[PDB]
Structure 1
Amino acid sequence: EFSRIVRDVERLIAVEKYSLQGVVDGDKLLVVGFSEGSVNAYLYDGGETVKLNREPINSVLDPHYGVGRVILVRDVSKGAEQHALFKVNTSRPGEEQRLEAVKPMRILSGVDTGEAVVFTGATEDRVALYALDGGGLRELARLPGFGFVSDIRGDLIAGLGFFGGGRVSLFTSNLSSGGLRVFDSGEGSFSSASISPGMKVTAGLETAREARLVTVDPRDGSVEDLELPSKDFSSYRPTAITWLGYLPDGRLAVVARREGRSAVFIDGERVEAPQGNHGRVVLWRGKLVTSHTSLSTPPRIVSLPSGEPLLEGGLPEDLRRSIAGSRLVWVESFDGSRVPTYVLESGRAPTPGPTVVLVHGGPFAEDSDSWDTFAASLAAAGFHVVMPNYRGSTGYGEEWRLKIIGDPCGGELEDVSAAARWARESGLASELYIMGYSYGGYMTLCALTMKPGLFKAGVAGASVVDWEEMYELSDAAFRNFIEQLTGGSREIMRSRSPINHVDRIKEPLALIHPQNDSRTPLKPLLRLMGELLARGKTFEAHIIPDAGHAINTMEDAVKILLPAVFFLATQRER
């Protein structure tokens, strides 16, 4: 029945998905949309979307309210994520002017004030904060690691820095003269940031098991808790902060979350919103607008508190019926920790039935009540889906997130393995598979090498294979992240690399990998194939042309997803 599968996977990939970016030109929404087979940028106003870009893009920079242009970010390296920036004047959609003062680099983030384009980027030798204005390009600061611009008000630039130990610092700079100041909390990590009318930095602070709001004065580094007019926020007791931002009327919008579902607050007061997860919030036409998604709702743009959709891709009825349910469960792991695990029940599988432990990437990411095309495709193909938030995940507090540091292929793998055991013991699973992309594919390899026999077969997509060789091929941002994750230990880099444990593998493995991935490079995957072959192991492989880690077309998504589904479907017929 592999042709009905191809049709489903294609349709699931093809459904339109929207992301809210801001408000530009004359009170028009700026949205990034996956539509017509690729990622594009649109203006929305009444009913007509207007396409701003020509060729597919990856993202746009964050515009200040009402600015008359959009800065596209586009990979100009066939997936290697050397990106260039292209200005589109909102009054002349489809006319792109490349910003040639900026040589290609990995663009990490940025904001457009209308007078300066401020962005962070990584090259081979550094990560930096840059400003481009009418006078040309300037390097404001070199950063100690991944950094992201959060907000600019006047000359004050605020951002978030991964500058050591897995922890997130706040940073500020000056638009006119550059420099850098770093603010490190001893309680936890800063999570989102926005500059108040008073020129203090409002930030989410994620502590051991909770999250709150703080005010940082960039002049003296003083921090204090921020109390809001309404106490709905406090009383919600979020674990994590998704996003926050000052609206143009001075009110503070915050999206915060717990147990994989978020809520929206304006000056601390709850605003009704559809169940699942939300993104940015903007004031448009004097009304509140956000993005929304859930496990059964592809990302869409909705009005609050109505919940009425402004932009939404429809899911076909027959596909909707493929997802028979979802649940959040707490799996007990090796040390007694409770692993929050999202479960998707297939309507096309019995119970007990074939079940895939689909391991998330990052590692600093989470499985949540948010749309997941891979999880949906598995349900449509007749597999239940188990999605464990292993230690290292976001969404459950700083202490759980930091447990991974210095211990890749250790406790987090136990968490994945405990989720696998739960799926069988709880009676959901008749047979067990493992699948993941990126850090998830790492986990597949680690499970098959370190836990032979636990799974029937594994799918490893865009995998980490060898920390040591990857390190040598990585840009400045990735080198630093590798050092942080591995705790700067060569012994960890080696012992936790599954290329060094190939002899232990006993289960069928499918490798899937984009040839131009600059994060998880193909080179070590070739050596892994060589090891599998020399040792007589069973394996299959699919390498995808002219694509990298970030997939921005339906054609590339099909090529990275379909083989995995075919492979698992074929395994299930054994």
Structure 2
Amino acid sequence: PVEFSRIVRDVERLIAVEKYSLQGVVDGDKLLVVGFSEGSVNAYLYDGGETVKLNREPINSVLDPHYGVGRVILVRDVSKGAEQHALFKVNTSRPGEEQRLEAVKPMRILSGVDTGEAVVFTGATEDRVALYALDGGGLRELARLPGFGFVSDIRGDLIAGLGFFGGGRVSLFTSNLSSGGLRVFDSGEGSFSSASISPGMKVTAGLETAREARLVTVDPRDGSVEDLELPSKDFSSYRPTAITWLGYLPDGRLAVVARREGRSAVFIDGERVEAPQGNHGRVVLWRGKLVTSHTSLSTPPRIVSLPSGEPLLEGGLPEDLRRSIAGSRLVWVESFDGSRVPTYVLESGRAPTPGPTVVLVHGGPFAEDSDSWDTFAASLAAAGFHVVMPNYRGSTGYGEEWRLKIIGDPCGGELEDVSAAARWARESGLASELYIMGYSYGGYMTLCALTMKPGLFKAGVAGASVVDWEEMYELSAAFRNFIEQLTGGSREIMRSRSPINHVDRIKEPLALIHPQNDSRTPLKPLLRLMGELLARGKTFEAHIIPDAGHAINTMEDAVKILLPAVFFLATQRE
């Protein structure tokens, strides 16, 4: 019989576990870390096995400090739930004492850096998006931005950042601290992902293309772009597809974190440094040693030392639960047309082999299953399910060709990909029985699978799903454009690939989890689906929830959204 209170207890601990991000080095030589829990967030100084809390009430984030600055700028929402933020300064020698920066009116704070002398940030109001500089003599608007924009780095008087200024791409920009203004460097056929200013006052940037990422140097004096050449060739030989973060360390070396196939690697002046398998955040130099953040499908975000990978700060889980979440691995699953589908697998320590296995389908579809911490997948492992996470075609992270294969073919090839992953789990000896679970586009897939491939999965869970493309099309500007694109402008594809037109074929129990009042995934089509299921005597469960937030932060959110799915699946295990 299902141990319900165990599942809720575990889901509780996985939601509560503290999660850490590295922000920089301050106060001479202390780590600045932001720690997150149950969606609640604080700022800490770390040094030598101990933390000190800097803020009082929960915050939203902090600005990027320059190495060594004696203060930290907290960003905090001014109402509870509102886009308007205010800025609060804390001296690192007087933690817990906050001085509100009254010169900055509430607004949506998008990013920022604190040089120690000037606070430079981007913000959005009713009027505009702007770059601002706050110094001792008050607030100045350096520039108005033609879109959402983010400060990456300041060195001397030169400011660099990334802007979403049109054409579907991230462009690079620069400004001056003293004179302001804006210069935009267009990314051409790629997008800039990160930027840092060299001692030579060049902007080094990560340029992501259709295929392989490029490290480039951009001379801000003339807009010239050249591939950057590093003293060690490890980085180039790695052939990354994306660049997560880069920055110059105080001693002038360039730190870069790049990734491919859902895992990242750390490089210093092109030379690779050993790091724990997974994904890494920013790298800082601290008392002569290198420090980064780490996360994986089995490891909540934490701070590690390199190259040992020893944790400095990590949240606590009980011995019991840590052992439920075993290692993650990547496997390349072969699909119907021979194309290989990169699929992350998370093994449960609480399930034998072969054992119950969930194929957990990501939303988007323009998104990626990477080797990074996921409350959903971890909850499944804790409840005694292996989790299989396939990057079906349409996914990001593997080049433009793979992403664009979904166009005109929803519920076609990408379903074969998902189906091949399931097959792979059964025949590899991992799975004794197979389930499917997914949210948004993932829920659409779930319904797509149970209709077009009955007898493949034992049960399905569909969250925030879409049911009928044609009805959705006529009810939706932005989403109508998207639906047109995805279906190749074909009403025949809208109709044939809508699961509500094939309910008749479902042979397996289905669990629907849906928001009561969200215009993005509306409820009306789901009631029709439920009427159809009922009329045809199909087994189904439904949980309809008002006022769900689109991300699992708190225990409340988890209970509404995640818990019923895990319960349902545990009962299907009969």
Which digits, 9 at most, give the CA deviation of each residue in 1:300-326, with x for residues without a partner?
211222333211224332223323443
C-alpha deviation, 1:497, in angstroms: 8.3
Please give the alpha-carbon distance, in whole angstroms, between the structure 2 residues aligned to 1:550 and 1:106: 20
Q: Which moved more, 1:439-448 or 1:57-66?
A: 439-448
Q: Indicate if the aligned counterparts of 1:78 and 1:546 stay in contact, CA closer than 8 A.
A: no
Measured at CA, do residues 142 and 325 of structure 1 come closer, stay the same or move farther in structure 2, by a change above 3 Å?
A: same
C-alpha deviation, 1:137, in angstroms: 5.8
Q: Indicate if the aligned counterparts of 1:516 and 1:548 stay in contact, CA closer than 8 A.
A: no
Which digits, 9 at most, give the CA deviation of each residue in 1:455-475, with x for residues without a partner?
44443446678999999999x
| Number of the residue aligned with 1:130 | 132
Please give the alpha-carbon distance, in whole angstroms, between the structure 2 residues aligned to 1:112 and 1:479: 42
Measured at CA, do residues 323 and 518 of structure 1 come closer, stay the same or move farther in structure 2, by a change above 3 Å?
A: same
Please give the alpha-carbon distance, in whole angstroms, between the structure 2 residues aligned to 1:99 and 1:299: 31
Q: Which has the larger radius of gyration?
A: 2
Measured at CA, do residues 275 and 445 of structure 1 come closer, stay the same or move farther in structure 2, by a change above 3 Å?
A: same
C-alpha deviation, 1:226, in angstroms: 0.7
State the TM-score, normalized to the length of structure 2: 0.81
Q: Indicate if the aligned counterparts of 2:361 and 2:437 stay in contact, CA closer than 8 A.
A: yes
Q: Indicate if the aligned counterparts of 1:56 and 1:552 stay in contact, CA closer than 8 A.
A: no
Which digits, 9 at most, give the CA deviation of each residue in 1:255-313, with x for residues without a partner?
12233322211111122222322211011223211112233322221122233321122
C-alpha deviation, 1:381, in angstroms: 0.8
Q: Indicate if the aligned counterparts of 2:515 and 2:521 stay in contact, CA closer than 8 A.
A: no
Q: Indicate if the aligned counterparts of 1:276 and 1:293 stay in contact, CA closer than 8 A.
A: yes
Please give the alpha-carbon distance, in whole angstroms, between the structure 2 residues aligned to 1:477 and 1:74: 31
Please give the alpha-carbon distance, in whole angstroms, between the structure 1 residues aligned to 2:118 and 2:499: 45
Q: Indicate if the aligned counterparts of 1:145 and 1:477 stay in contact, CA closer than 8 A.
A: no
Task: Show the 5 A alignment for 1:65-464.
Answer: 65-75=67-77, 79=81, 83-97=85-99, 107-120=109-122, 129-132=131-134, 147-163=149-165, 167-175=169-177, 179-186=181-188, 188-361=190-363, 363=365, 365-401=367-403, 412-437=414-439, 440-441=442-443, 443-444=445-446, 447=449, 454-461=456-463
C-alpha deviation, 1:524, in angstroms: 9.0
Q: Which moved more, 1:65-74 or 1:103-112?
A: 103-112
C-alpha deviation, 1:412, in angstroms: 4.3
Q: Indicate if the aligned counterparts of 1:67 and 1:114 stay in contact, CA closer than 8 A.
A: yes
Please give the alpha-carbon distance, in whole angstroms, between the structure 2 residues aligned to 1:553 and 1:226: 43
Measured at CA, do residues 77 and 259 of structure 1 come closer, stay the same or move farther in structure 2, by a change above 3 Å?
A: same
Please give the alpha-carbon distance, in whole angstroms, between the structure 2 residues aligned to 1:41 and 1:411: 45
Please give the alpha-carbon distance, in whole angstroms, between the structure 1 residues aligned to 2:115 and 2:62: 13
Helix, strand or coil: the match of 1:33? strand
C-alpha deviation, 1:131, in angstroms: 4.9
State the TM-score, normalized to the length of structure 1: 0.81
Which digits, 9 at most, give the CA deviation of each residue in 1:35-76, with x for residues without a partner?
588332211122321122333334323222223333334455
Measured at CA, do residues 505 and 68 of structure 1 come closer, stay the same or move farther in structure 2, by a change above 3 Å?
A: farther
Q: Indicate if the aligned counterparts of 1:519 and 1:549 stay in contact, CA closer than 8 A.
A: no
Q: Indicate if the aligned counterparts of 2:41 and 2:58 stay in contact, CA closer than 8 A.
A: yes
Measured at CA, do residues 266 and 532 of structure 1 come closer, stay the same or move farther in structure 2, by a change above 3 Å?
A: same
Which digits, 9 at most, give the CA deviation of each residue in 1:59-112, with x for residues without a partner?
323222223333334455655655554443433333445556666665443333
Measured at CA, do residues 355 and 53 of structure 1 come closer, stay the same or move farther in structure 2, by a change above 3 Å?
A: same
C-alpha deviation, 1:378, in angstroms: 0.5
Please give the alpha-carbon distance, in whole angstroms, between the structure 2 residues aligned to 1:25 and 1:170: 31
Please give the alpha-carbon distance, in whole angstroms, between the structure 2 residues aligned to 1:428 and 1:358: 15
Q: Which moved more, 1:5-14 or 1:174-183?
A: 174-183
Q: Indicate if the aligned counterparts of 2:122 and 2:150 stay in contact, CA closer than 8 A.
A: yes
Measured at CA, do residues 95 and 260 of structure 1 come closer, stay the same or move farther in structure 2, by a change above 3 Å?
A: same
Q: Which moved more, 1:53-62 or 1:537-546?
A: 537-546
Measured at CA, do residues 216 and 529 of structure 1 come closer, stay the same or move farther in structure 2, by a change above 3 Å?
A: farther
Please give the alpha-carbon distance, in whole angstroms, between the structure 1 residues aligned to 2:56 and 2:515: 24
Measured at CA, do residues 48 and 561 of structure 1 come closer, stay the same or move farther in structure 2, by a change above 3 Å?
A: same
Q: Indicate if the aligned counterparts of 1:79 and 1:549 stay in contact, CA closer than 8 A.
A: no
Helix, strand or coil: the match of 1:465? coil
Q: Higher RCO, 1 or 2 (CA under 8 Å, sep at least 6)?
A: 1
Please give the alpha-carbon distance, in whole angstroms, between the structure 2 residues aligned to 1:355 and 1:190: 38
Which digits, 9 at most, give the CA deviation of each residue in 1:231-273, with x for residues without a partner?
2222223232221111122110011223332221111112222
Measured at CA, do residues 254 and 514 of structure 1 come closer, stay the same or move farther in structure 2, by a change above 3 Å?
A: farther
> Between the two proteins, what is the percent identity of the paired residues?
100
Measured at CA, do residues 214 and 405 of structure 1 come closer, stay the same or move farther in structure 2, by a change above 3 Å?
A: farther
Please give the alpha-carbon distance, in whole angstroms, between the structure 1 residues aligned to 2:29 and 2:319: 35
Measured at CA, do residues 323 and 279 of structure 1 come closer, stay the same or move farther in structure 2, by a change above 3 Å?
A: same
Measured at CA, do residues 536 and 14 of structure 1 come closer, stay the same or move farther in structure 2, by a change above 3 Å?
A: same
Q: Indicate if the aligned counterparts of 1:145 and 1:481 stay in contact, CA closer than 8 A.
A: no
Please give the alpha-carbon distance, in whole angstroms, between the structure 2 residues aligned to 1:270 and 1:215: 20
Please give the alpha-carbon distance, in whole angstroms, between the structure 2 residues aligned to 1:329 and 1:99: 51
Please give the alpha-carbon distance, in whole angstroms, between the structure 2 residues aligned to 1:280 and 1:53: 22
C-alpha deviation, 1:386, in angstroms: 0.6
Please give the alpha-carbon distance, in whole angstroms, between the structure 2 residues aligned to 1:144 and 1:449: 46
Q: Indicate if the aligned counterparts of 2:549 and 2:557 stay in contact, CA closer than 8 A.
A: no
Q: Indicate if the aligned counterparts of 1:247 and 1:282 stay in contact, CA closer than 8 A.
A: yes
Q: Which moved more, 1:198-207 or 1:481-490?
A: 481-490
Please give the alpha-carbon distance, in whole angstroms, between the structure 2 residues aligned to 1:130 and 1:493: 47
Q: CA RMSD in A?
A: 4.5
C-alpha deviation, 1:411, in angstroms: 5.0
Please give the alpha-carbon distance, in whole angstroms, between the structure 1 residues aligned to 2:106 and 2:515: 20
Please give the alpha-carbon distance, in whole angstroms, between the structure 1 residues aligned to 2:422 and 2:540: 22
Measured at CA, do residues 450 and 555 of structure 1 come closer, stay the same or move farther in structure 2, by a change above 3 Å?
A: same
Q: Indicate if the aligned counterparts of 1:348 and 1:383 stay in contact, CA closer than 8 A.
A: yes
Q: Which moved more, 1:1-10 or 1:33-42?
A: 33-42
Q: Which runs of 5+ in 1 are unaligned?
A: none
Measured at CA, do residues 409 and 39 of structure 1 come closer, stay the same or move farther in structure 2, by a change above 3 Å?
A: farther
C-alpha deviation, 1:194, in angstroms: 1.1
Q: Which moved more, 1:127-136 or 1:1-10?
A: 127-136
Q: Which moved more, 1:29-38 or 1:214-223?
A: 29-38
Helix, strand or coil: the match of 2:235? helix
Q: Indicate if the aligned counterparts of 1:435 and 1:444 stay in contact, CA closer than 8 A.
A: yes
Q: Indicate if the aligned counterparts of 1:515 and 1:544 stay in contact, CA closer than 8 A.
A: yes
- How many residues in Structure 1 have an aligned counterpart in Structure 2? 572
Helix, strand or coil: the match of 2:164? strand
Q: Which moved more, 1:559-568 or 1:262-271?
A: 559-568
Q: Indicate if the aligned counterparts of 1:517 and 1:549 stay in contact, CA closer than 8 A.
A: no
Q: Indicate if the aligned counterparts of 1:240 and 1:396 stay in contact, CA closer than 8 A.
A: no
C-alpha deviation, 1:20, in angstroms: 0.7
C-alpha deviation, 1:565, in angstroms: 1.2
Q: Indicate if the aligned counterparts of 2:121 and 2:133 stay in contact, CA closer than 8 A.
A: yes
Please give the alpha-carbon distance, in whole angstroms, between the structure 2 residues aligned to 1:171 and 1:395: 25
Measured at CA, do residues 497 and 241 of structure 1 come closer, stay the same or move farther in structure 2, by a change above 3 Å?
A: farther
Measured at CA, do residues 532 and 348 of structure 1 come closer, stay the same or move farther in structure 2, by a change above 3 Å?
A: same
Q: Indicate if the aligned counterparts of 2:28 and 2:67 stay in contact, CA closer than 8 A.
A: no
C-alpha deviation, 1:533, in angstroms: 8.6
Q: Indicate if the aligned counterparts of 1:146 and 1:481 stay in contact, CA closer than 8 A.
A: no
Which digits, 9 at most, give the CA deviation of each residue in 1:515-534, with x for residues without a partner?
89899799998998899899
Q: Indicate if the aligned counterparts of 1:166 and 1:402 stay in contact, CA closer than 8 A.
A: no
Measured at CA, do residues 554 and 34 of structure 1 come closer, stay the same or move farther in structure 2, by a change above 3 Å?
A: farther
Q: Which moved more, 1:84-93 or 1:536-545?
A: 536-545
Measured at CA, do residues 151 and 532 of structure 1 come closer, stay the same or move farther in structure 2, by a change above 3 Å?
A: farther
Measured at CA, do residues 307 and 163 of structure 1 come closer, stay the same or move farther in structure 2, by a change above 3 Å?
A: same
Measured at CA, do residues 231 and 483 of structure 1 come closer, stay the same or move farther in structure 2, by a change above 3 Å?
A: farther
Which digits, 9 at most, give the CA deviation of each residue in 1:377-436, with x for residues without a partner?
101211110111233444333543455678776654553343234334444334333323
